[PDB]
Amino acid sequence: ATSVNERIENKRRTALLGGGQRRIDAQHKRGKLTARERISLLLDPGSFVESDMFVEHRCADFGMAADKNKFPGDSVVTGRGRINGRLVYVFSQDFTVFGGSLSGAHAQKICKIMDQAITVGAPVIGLNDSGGARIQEGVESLAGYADIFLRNVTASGVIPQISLIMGPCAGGAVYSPALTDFTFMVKDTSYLFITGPDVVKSVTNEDVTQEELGGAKTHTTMSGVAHRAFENDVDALCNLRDFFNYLPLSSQDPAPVRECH
Amino acid sequence: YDPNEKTFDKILVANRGEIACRVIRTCKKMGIKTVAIHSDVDASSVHVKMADEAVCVGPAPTSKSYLNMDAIMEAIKKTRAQAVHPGYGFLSENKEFARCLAAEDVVFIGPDTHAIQAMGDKIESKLLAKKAEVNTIPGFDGVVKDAEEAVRIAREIGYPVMIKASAGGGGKGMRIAWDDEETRDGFRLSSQEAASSFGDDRLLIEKFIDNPRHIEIQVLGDKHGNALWLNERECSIQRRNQKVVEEAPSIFLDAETRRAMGEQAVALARAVKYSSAGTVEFLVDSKKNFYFLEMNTRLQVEHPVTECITGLDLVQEMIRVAKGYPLRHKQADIRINGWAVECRVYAEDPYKSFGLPSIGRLSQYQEPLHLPGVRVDSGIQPGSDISIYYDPMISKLITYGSDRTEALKRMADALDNYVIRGVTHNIALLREVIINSRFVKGDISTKFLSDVYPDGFKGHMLTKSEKNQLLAIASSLFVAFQLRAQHFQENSRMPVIKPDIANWELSVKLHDKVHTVVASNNGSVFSVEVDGSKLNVTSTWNLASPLLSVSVDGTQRTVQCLSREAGGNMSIQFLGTVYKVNILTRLAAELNKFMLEKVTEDTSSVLRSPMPGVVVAVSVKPGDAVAEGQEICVIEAMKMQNSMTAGKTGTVKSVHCQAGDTVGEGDLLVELE
């Protein structure tokens, strides 16, 4: 008798529920969904293939060795799928697991997805909502960001890259969306800034809050970082589908041609 | 250097800089562990990393770091040291420190408390010397209290009068007024000055010796009643009452006078019961009459120059005497062996009042240790810093030979081959003094610097031949750089076509004069025509080494290239002085007469600070009208206070300096119309 089969079910039901039901309820109260249903609405039904769902971080500092800080998947869902019959690779961050803060396994999964996409020649779509780099790793988070930036720069001009900011992205995670072709926003829930308002309090001593600091209005009206803004998440994802229906899979292919009337 | 004899095992050096390194080296050779104190800014000093162990004693200011007795005592107690060497300065003549050290357990390397107390004031010293049958300066004993008593003394002592502030001093608090009105006003203002400085306000009246020479007899004593005089030294080149150039034997003295002075100094030392190394200073008039003046109860700054001609190590003798061993020499065994000259290299600008302190960090530093008969005592290494809290002395350079001429020539060569980059130094003054006709002849006095340059130091005035040599060297260097610029590697796609210029025609601008130079190259030899004159310049032409040795008409010369820029401006150090030259091609020179002169909005009316430091006193306020010849404000930095003068009349629109402010070099202070 081996428990190597009930372990699979326990790990899967933990991964499908993220970091707990309380965090899911808190996310829903804020008007935000979770990663897996964004993936489901973004892709065609019955076409999503997940990868690296059993990858775990390796930290052994500041008490993460306990099981209470042990989460399968490591705050990211990565896979491949089809939109209107055309291949694409997708990754999303889970805000329930340490606020989506990136670690070694997170960066490794993103890097494997990007490597597969550049090898086969398929576009990349990223749904970003993460709090930055997790401190207790140290330099490995910086190495992960550097690797993501390197692969973003290498694939530039070869395959298209798209990003949706669906939540507060702060710290060094704001540079991957800036290195892609297009950047989109979701109003009233998405933010983008280098540092929080507390540092502004400390150094500049002037009154400002988060909304005009890094809100969608600021970046779509007087900053020039984002391209468009959307009312909510479902409309944003439908518009992303429609937009992706416009552009080709690679620079080696001609511009798409559709049926006309 | 016999290590068999037992001596102390751990000695703490309560000083910084050159003397600290010298003492550490002497103890290291003789086999004694060392301890070195330092401040927060001295954490990366040469002496700190040269000695075992270190103890920080406080912040940057000298009042809290090197004059803080409590910190030194704590460091000595913690390090379990057995003896302390104060060096010179700081707590080297302070009787409280010696008393405390003798009280606790510690052996203090130097004279006892009684000798320091006796040779501490300018009153008891004179009476003791007169009791010791030593010739003294004519004068009146007892502190003058009123101007009437001063002038009453003045009639009988003679019209020339020297009024002196008792105690303190160290190069300040002296004035030479002779007139009765001058007598009373000097009395009042010197009283208030003494009150400001040290507050005792005791003044003495003595005859002012005119045209004197300063002669120092070095004496060495032990605890068993023995005394020796280690020949004499001649120290007459002074500015601000501080020596710069010292000479080991005195060319002005013969055997009999030297013996008389040495015997008198030894008699004084026996009278005060001196039991360490020290010096006795004399003033000698033109008629070979010597008068006693001061006795330093400590190691002298210019001690090494008397070790060259004697062959002793003074720091070792002091340590052995402090242990208790008697002297191992006799007066008959002390002899003169050769000749020696010592120069002090400071960090100061020699073009302002014969030296004005400056700050900075050293980018390059090389000493001429490979030259024959050269010794360098420095507390500096590349990357060192110069702070505004301490004496800006950088190095001491000693040269020895078999006679005066050889020593002077070696000193000039060593000064030519000495590399300092990062700060401003007084090497130009040191090199130009040692070639003066009067100094070589031997006719010098205390006011040698005050009448050779009535208007101040301007630089080395170069003759026609030296001017031609400088022009030829500059042209050769410029053409060498131009030739070096043309050497590329092989391209294999577009070959380089080297130009075949035969003669380079150049316009050379120096001071306010323009010369035409024709230069030809024949390998490693340049043929230069300067206004008809023909010269040949040959050298290895290494454009990266800091020092460049060339041969002009057989004469060997050493030059340095301080700076170079593409517009044609060059700075060349040549025979000690830095000359700024502008070299252009003849065609470019023709087209430079069409360029409008850049208007400069600086014609006096600006009182920017000539030195960095802290301003403490300001004598004017904005909106006032000033006149000529009065000071505006005083800045204190590097053991020195300086007040800028006047000479133009205007109204002070604003003042940018207040008491306690910190001002850098060249910062504007007073604006006026």
């Binding site: 500041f62 401190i135 530039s156 290195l179 280098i194 007087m222 620079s251 | -």
Partner: protein, 247 residues
């Protein structure tokens, strides 16, 4: 000018206390041949210094931070100033030498409204795209994503060195303590232990992010040898007409 000349002037140029500032131009002059340096844009965006120099006779481009101005923080102007120079040097097969002392990016609302993200992306892409040999030396500080922007080992860098006074972290100790040890509400011992364990260049060395920890006096002799080895470096990249600059 020999390539193995020692430079003991740099052994103590970096102050021990982190509040003081130093001049990077002194280090640059000490390292390069004949102490000759041609600086580009010397009066604009003075918090970064870029220029041309010669190393063993070969032309090199130099990029560095200036802690004298704005404590070395990056901003909008310096990002473009560095990016254009780096792109030019990469285009014409000129090696790059970098001196890193950066606390991060300049905070404020004017910088945010001006689009600091775009210009940070400019500099990041400019360093990541380069295929010429590149050598980096870390002097004092490398904090956060800025360390990633300054040509780290992870952007296909060639050789990375750190001086014994260097130190790399995500940010300062106080921020890490206040973001990690919040429940403990005791920052007395926490800050001390954190600065004792992580305020040093060893965490980056043990993972192999920096090749060696070198004495400053041997900096120049270390660089020259590297430029002799990396002169024949060649790399291959996927085909494309051109990439998408964040312009």
């Amino acid at each position: 000018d020999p390539s193995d000349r020692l430079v003991p002037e740099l052994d103590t140029i970096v102050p021990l206390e982190s509040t003081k500032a130093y001049n990077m131009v002194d280090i640059i002059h000490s390292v390069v041949d004949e102490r000759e340096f041609f600086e580009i844009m010397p009066n604009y965006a003075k918090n970064i210094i870029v220029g041309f120099a010669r190393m063993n006779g070969r032309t090199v481009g130099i990029v560095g931070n200036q802690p004298k101005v704005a404590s070395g923080c990056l901003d909008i102007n310096s990002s473009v100033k560095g990016a254009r120079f780096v792109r030019f040097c990469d285009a014409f097969n000129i090696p790059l030498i970098t001196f890193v002392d950066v606390p991060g990016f300049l905070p404020g609302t004017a910088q945010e409204y001006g689009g600091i993200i775009r210009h940070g992306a400019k500099l990041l892409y400019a360093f990541a795209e380069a295929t010429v040999p590149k050598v980096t030396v870390i002097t004092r500080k490398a904090y956060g994503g800025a360390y990633d922007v300054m040509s780290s080992k992870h952007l296909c860098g060639d050789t990375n060195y750190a001086w014994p006074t260097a130190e790399i972290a995500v940010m300062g100790a106080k921020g890490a303590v206040e973001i990690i040890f919040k429940g403990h509400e005791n920052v007395e011992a926490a800050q001390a232990e954190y600065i004792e364990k992580f305020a040093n260049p060893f965490p980056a060395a043990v993972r192999g992010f920096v090749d060696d920890i070198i004495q400053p006096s041997s900096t120049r002799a270390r660089i020259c040898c590297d430029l002799d080895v990396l002169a024949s470096k060649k790399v291959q990249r996927p085909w494309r007409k051109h990439a998408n600059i964040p312009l």
